[PDB]
């Protein structure tokens, strides 16, 4: 029943600089276990739907790295022990995302990133022609 | 008046100006005691759960005030749970708190369902006396404490347990 | 006969925990990795620095808590912060546990130049999975 | 000597809000999770191990701090820090008409004490002639 | 033109966490952090 | 103390190479270009060979950082083959598992 | 361990309530499937062993079935066969043998009265009935059995089932009956598709030895195949490869009655030729009657080729060849 009344105090100063428009934002998460990435996709999709982003999710093909090492510590080169590192992929595309909405979505996504995965963002910012090109100069 | 003081404390980050630990304990000591009798026990219990033990640990006198509120509110079914929380809150071996609980449970006769609950609590209280940490210096069993425990294990269908209590009166004089 | 990270059968009187009861070929099949970080991904750099830091913590935590450590540490690296999860027996008084927690957090943070989190779970004795 | 207090699971309410218990990402605490969860390969005739003293439930990156109840509460508060995409730029064809230059940039996040990735300096500029 | 570029919103780098901190209150059964 | 005297020698060798890395690069540029006069290139060869012997990139030896095994070392983890198996078989390396296919 | 099961039952119900509370669903319909999808989300374990993943189910389903207490406080066994070691199995044998004598006695009385009102109901072939497996039987009697004991019990049922059958016996027998799933090797005929005034065109998928083939066949054209935008003769100079494409069409005597276009990628000349052959066989099932589709299977057209290149073992020259073995 007893709660801290009005414990919210953030400020959002709306300046005069025009916002940056991103044509399309691509997020590619890579990890070792599918289950973590499967849950992470659900978290990203659920948050994206609530913000109204209309995202699409696809799974790029995986790649497997293998290498071979000797077994014993002396001679015996006919017996090998192999190892394998598996990197599973998952891509989340974002379309028609403004700069202001991009900042909050990415930082909210990045802070909740699990320890066993990492991600790369490819932002396709769009803008008009340069002043020299736009303004007629021969 | 206290709610306006407490309401101000919970606004924004004003809670960081409460003071030190002993000041925080003292601030909630006086405030919680006011919550006992000035308000209905139904809302007092809600504040008891929220404030304790998350914010502060109750003092022995504060437990006495809570017991008084229950007695005035005509509710003795919560007494066994209070004793269980008392041990968790560092009041396992408080002589002042033990006497109050034993007197209240055995003050009046109760239906068998409620009497068994007091008997279970009394047995736990009896075990605490057996394993006091003051036995190294001096173990003391109060005269009142032995009497109420013996009386309690009579009406709960524990006549066999009452027989062992008869010999304690002569052993402790 | 393979001998890598195995405990040999000796009657039925030696307790074995879950980690030690599984052969190394069971990794990623029955038991996970004790440490998780980005360094060993496909196209990620900085994998040797993480490995040497990981080994040091295996030797520091084992020596900071003599005898009271239950089994292997679990190291999680999120952002630039380092989380260390441990199982500790009920050996030292709680005053000493908080001293060592405070000592470990400050020393490692100023040594690796990164924030360190130290989370402890206390158990009465070593957890036994087979034999015993 | 010192004894072990009962876990807070017993005192946990039935209808209490979960996200208040876990505000941030934290490791799986057996006392702090009311859910009885068992994992690990079972014995020949037995059941998987309990949630107390189990390392298998500690290695996993938990998602208790991102419960769907918490996700809606988290995201809704963030809706203040946003601005709408202009409605006139609905079709992708119109985007080319009003903005003929698109620029590709990359940012990389990895676990470690350093963020410097030399692959983050590339810039790809594409223009429709 | 039929397109109006909306004005950007500028906030401090720590205000984003305080927005999430508002949603989560203190826990009744939890010991101090 | 490094694990062996050989490891200590490598640290001195790497340290010396770093100090003379830029100076060697500037002089080596003259030698590797055919547009400069041959007389100047002969003088450059004398100067580049007058530098201390340890300040040579080719003399740097890649060992294991734990046991200093001169060979059988994976370049990615900078670990010997024996030590790498010791860490990987216990599950102490993320994403490393026994290969089965 | 009766009480331990009881404790697990009550806390699992309490635990289920907490899981529904945090998931924000209706606790009255928090089914087990919903529990599994909730657990798989909260604890994302990436492990290949399906049994090693986190689980939270009904303790009756998790804990193995336990034997009940066999004696009272005075030590007297409850059942009358407890001193045979295996009370459950022998009691089942005693009851089963008793039913046979009762049937034999009842049949003997019926023969005396000159009445045969029973019929043999053992034949359950259309339902696909099979007897209990030894593992399944051990989980029904809650007791371990042996191969000799299981065979004797099954043979006794056959004697019971071979006699005239009564209503009570059939219920007793049917508890030991199990139904096999549907067995059939017929393929699913893909219905013909019509698109943009195009009539009778079907699509097929084929794969053989790292080579996938996409074949769409039109039933309204002359005899020609266009692979990758070029004529098939140019694309398959080898006579054998062009024989593979003939094989499906020639088997159905429709060499010139279909116009096809193909798109095959990966592999060598023979891998693609085999892949296109497989794709046509599956794509031509739409235009052909069902009886000849069975003929197609008996000729091996519709079955994928499982032969793929093996790996190279570490320590051997090839997949099977080893280095020269010098004895001395
Ligand atoms: Mg040495
Ligand atoms: Mg030369
Ligand atoms: Mg060399
Ligand atoms: Mg060969």
- Which positions in chain E touch B49 (Cβ < 8 Å)? 28
Residue A82: closest CA among C38, F81, C34: F81
The CATH label, of 1.10.287.1480, 3.40.50.150, 1.10.357.10, 3.30.70.260, for the domain at F1-91 is 1.10.287.1480
Contacts of residue B108, Cβ cutoff 8 Å, sequence gap at least 6:
none
Is A129 close to D101, i.e. CB distance below 8 A?
Answer: yes
Q: Cβ of D54: how many Cβ atoms within 10 Å? A: 23
In chain A, which among 20-39 make CB contacts under 8 A with chain G?
Answer: 32-36, 38-39
Can you tell me the distance from the alpha carbon of D47 to that of D34, in angstroms, rounded to the nearest whole number?
A: 19
Six token digits for residue B32: 């919680």
Can you tell me the distance from the alpha carbon of B47 to that of B53, in angstroms, rounded to the nearest whole number?
A: 11
Can you tell me the distance from the alpha carbon of A133 to that of A120, in angstroms, rounded to the nearest whole number?
A: 32
Residue A25: closest CA among A89, A92, A88: A92
Residue C38, min C-alpha distance to chain A (Å): 6
Contacts of residue C4, Cβ cutoff 8 Å, sequence gap at least 6:
C23, C24, F85, F89
Can you tell me the distance from the alpha carbon of G89 to that of A43, in angstroms, rounded to the nearest whole number?
A: 53
Ligand nearest to the CA of G319: 4
- Element spanning G201, H or E: strand G198-207
Six token digits for residue B81: 């749970």
Residue C32, min C-alpha distance to chain A (Å): 10
C130 and C18 Cβ atoms separated by less than 8 Å: no
Can you tell me the distance from the alpha carbon of G171 to that of G151, in angstroms, rounded to the nearest whole number?
A: 21
Residue C104, min C-alpha distance to chain D (Å): 18
Do chain F and chain E touch with ≥3 beta carbon pairs under 8 Å?
A: no
Which CA distances in Å does C84 have to C74, C107, D105? 6, 14, 35
Is G42 close to D12, i.e. CB distance below 8 A?
Answer: no
Do chain D and chain C touch with ≥3 beta carbon pairs under 8 Å?
A: yes
Burial class (CB in 10 A: 0-12, 13-18, 19+), B67: buried
Six token digits for residue G298: 């008996």
Can you tell me the distance from the alpha carbon of C92 to that of G211, in angstroms, rounded to the nearest whole number?
A: 66
What single string gives the DSSP state of each residue in chain F?
--SSHHHHHHHHHHHHHHHTHHHHHHHHHHHT-SSS-HHHHHHHHHHHHHS-TT--GGG-----TTT--SSSEETTTTEEHHHHHHHHHTT-STT-EE---
Strand, helix or coil at C77?
A: strand
> Parallel, antiparallel, or unpaired: how do β-strands G193-195 and G198-207 relate?
antiparallel
Q: Cβ of B53: how many Cβ atoms within 10 Å? A: 17
Six token digits for residue B173: 């004089």
Q: Which of G43, G47, G61, G62 to mutate to test the interface with D (most CBs of D within 10 A)?
A: G43
Q: Cβ of D48: how many Cβ atoms within 10 Å? A: 20
Can you tell me the distance from the alpha carbon of C113 to that of C110, in angstroms, rounded to the nearest whole number?
A: 5
Determination technique for this entry:
cryo-EM
Residue C16: closest CA among C4, C8, C24: C8
Six token digits for residue B4: 């306006």
Q: Give the experimental resolution in Å.
A: 3.6
β-partners of residue C78 are C81
> Which residue's structure tokens are 């909210």?
A108
- Give me the residue spans of the domains in chain F: 1-91
**CB contact C113 to D (< 8 Å):** yes
Cis ω for the linkage preceding G196 (within 30 of 0): no
């Amino acid at each position: 029943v007893d709660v801290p009344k009005d414990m919210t105090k953030p400020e959002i100063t709306i300046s005069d600089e025009p916002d940056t428009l991103y044509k399309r934002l691509s997020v590619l998460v890579k990890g070792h276990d599918k289950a973590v990435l499967d849950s992470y996709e659900y978290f990203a999709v659920l948050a994206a739907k609530e913000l109204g982003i209309s995202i699409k999710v696809h799974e790029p093909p995986r790649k497997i790295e293998r290498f071979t090492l000797l077994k014993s510590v002396h001679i015996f080169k006919k017996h090998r022990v192999q190892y394998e590192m598996r990197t599973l992929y998952r891509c989340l595309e974002l379309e028609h995302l403004t700069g202001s909405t991009a900042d909050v979505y990415l930082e909210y996504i990045q802070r909740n990133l699990p320890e066993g995965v990492a991600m790369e963002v490819t932002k396709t910012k769009l803008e008009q022609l340069p002043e020299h090109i736009r303004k007629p100069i021969w | 008046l206290a709610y306006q003081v407490h309401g101000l404390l919970n606004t924004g980050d004003n809670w960081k100006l409460i003071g030190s630990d002993h000041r925080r304990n003292f601030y909630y000591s006086k405030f919680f005691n006011l919550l006992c009798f000035m308000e209905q026990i139904d809302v007092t219990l809600k504040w008891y759960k929220d404030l304790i033990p998350s914010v502060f640990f109750p003092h022995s006198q504060t437990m006495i005030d809570l017991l008084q509120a229950l007695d005035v509110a005509n509710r003795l079914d919560m007494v066994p749970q209070i004793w269980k929380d008392s041990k968790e809150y560092g009041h396992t071996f408080r002589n002042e708190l033990k006497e109050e609980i034993l007197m209240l449970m055995a003050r009046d006769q109760h239906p068998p369902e409620l009497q068994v609950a007091f008997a279970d609590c009394a047995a736990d209280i009896k075990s605490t006396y057996e394993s006091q940490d003051a036995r190294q210096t001096a173990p003391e069993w109060p005269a009142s404490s032995l009497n109420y425990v013996a009386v309690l294990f009579l009406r709960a269908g524990r006549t066999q347990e009452a027989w062992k209590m008869l010999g304690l009166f002569r052993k402790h004089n | 006969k393979n001998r890598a990270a195995r405990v040999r059968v000796s009657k039925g009187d030696k307790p074995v925990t879950y980690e030690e009861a599984h052969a190394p070929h069971y990794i990623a099949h029955r038991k996970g990795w004790l440490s998780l970080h980005t360094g060993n991904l496909d196209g990620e750099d900085h994998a040797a620095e993480r490995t040497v830091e990981d080994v040091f913590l295996r030797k520091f935590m084992l020596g900071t808590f003599p005898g009271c450590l239950a089994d292997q540490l679990v190291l999680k690296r999120r952002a630039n912060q380092l989380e260390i999860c441990a199982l500790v027996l009920r050996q030292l008084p709680p005053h000493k546990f908080y001293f060592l927690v405070g000592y470990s957090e400050t020393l490692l943070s100023h040594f690796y130049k990164c924030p360190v989190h130290l989370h402890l779970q206390t158990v009465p004795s070593k957890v036994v999975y087979k034999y015993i | 000597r010192r004894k072990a207090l009962p876990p807070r699971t017993e005192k946990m309410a039935v209808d209490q809000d979960w996200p208040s218990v876990y505000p941030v990402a934290a490791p799986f605490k057996p006392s702090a999770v009311p859910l009885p969860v068992r994992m690990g390969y079972p014995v020949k005739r037995g059941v998987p191990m309990a949630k107390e003293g189990n390392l298998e439930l500690l290695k996993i990156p938990n998602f208790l701090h991102l419960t769907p109840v918490a996700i809606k509460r988290h995201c809704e508060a963030l809706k203040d820090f946003c601005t709408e995409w202009p409605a006139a730029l609905d079709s992708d064809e119109k985007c080319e008409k009003h903005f003929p230059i698109e620029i590709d940039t990359a940012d990389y996040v990895s676990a470690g004490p350093s963020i410097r990735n030399p692959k983050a300096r590339v810039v790809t500029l594409r223009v429709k002639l | 033109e039929e397109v109006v570029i909306p004005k950007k919103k500028t906030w401090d780098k720590v205000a984003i966490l305080q927005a999430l901190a508002s949603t989560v209150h203190r826990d009744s059964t939890a010991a101090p952090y | 103390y490094y694990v062996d005297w050989k490891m200590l020698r490598d640290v001195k060798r790497r340290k010396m190479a770093y100090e003379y890395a830029d100076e060697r690069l500037r002089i080596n540029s003259l030698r590797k270009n055919t547009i400069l006069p041959k007389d100047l290139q002969e003088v450059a060869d004398e100067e580049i060979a007058s530098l201390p012997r340890d300040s040579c990139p080719v003399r740097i030896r890649n060992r294991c950082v734990m046991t200093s095994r001169p060979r059988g070392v994976k370049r990615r983890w900078r670990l010997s083959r024996i030590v790498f198996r010791h860490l990987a078989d216990h599950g102490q390396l993320s994403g490393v598992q026994r290969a089965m296919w | 361990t009766v009480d331990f099961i009881k404790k697990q039952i009550e806390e699992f119900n309490i635990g289920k309530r907490h899981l529904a509370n945090m998931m924000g669903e209706d606790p009255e319909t928090f089914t087990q499937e919903d529990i599994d999808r909730a657990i798989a989300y909260l604890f994302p374990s990436g492990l290949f062993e399906k049994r090693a993943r986190p689980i939270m189910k009904h303790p009756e389903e998790i804990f193995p079935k336990q034997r009940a207490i066999q004696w009272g406080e005075d030590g007297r066994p409850f059942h009358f066969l407890f001193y045979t070691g295996k009370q459950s199995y022998y009691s089942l044998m005693h009851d089963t043998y008793g039913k046979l004598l009762d049937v034999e006695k009842h049949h003997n009385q019926l023969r005396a009265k000159d009445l045969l009102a029973e019929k043999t109901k053992i034949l359950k072939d259309p339902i696909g009935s099979r007897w209990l497996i030894k593992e399944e039987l051990e989980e029904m009697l809650v007791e371990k059995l042996s191969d000799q004991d299981y065979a004797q019990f099954i043979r006794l049922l056959e004697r019971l089932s071979a006699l005239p059958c009564g209503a009570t016996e059939e219920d007793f027998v049917n508890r030991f009956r199990r139904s096999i799933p549907i067995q059939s090797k017929k393929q699913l005929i893909e219905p013909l598709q019509y698109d943009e005034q195009g009539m009778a065109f079907s699509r097929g998928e084929g794969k053989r030895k790292t080579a996938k083939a996409e074949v769409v066949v039109y039933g309204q054209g002359s005899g020609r195949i266009d692979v990758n935008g070029v004529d098939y003769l140019l694309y398959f100079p080898v006579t054998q490869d062009r024989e593979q494409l003939m094989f499906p069409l020639h088997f159905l005597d429709r060499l010139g009655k279909h116009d096809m276009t193909c798109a095959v990628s990966g592999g060598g000349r023979s891998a693609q030729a085999g892949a296109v052959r497989l794709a046509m066989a599956r794509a031509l099932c739409s235009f052909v009657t069902e009886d000849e589709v069975e003929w197609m299977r008996q000729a091996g057209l519709l079955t994928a080729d499982p032969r793929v290149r093996e790996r190279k073992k570490p320590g051997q020259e090839g997949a099977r060849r080893k280095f020269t073995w010098k004895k001395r």
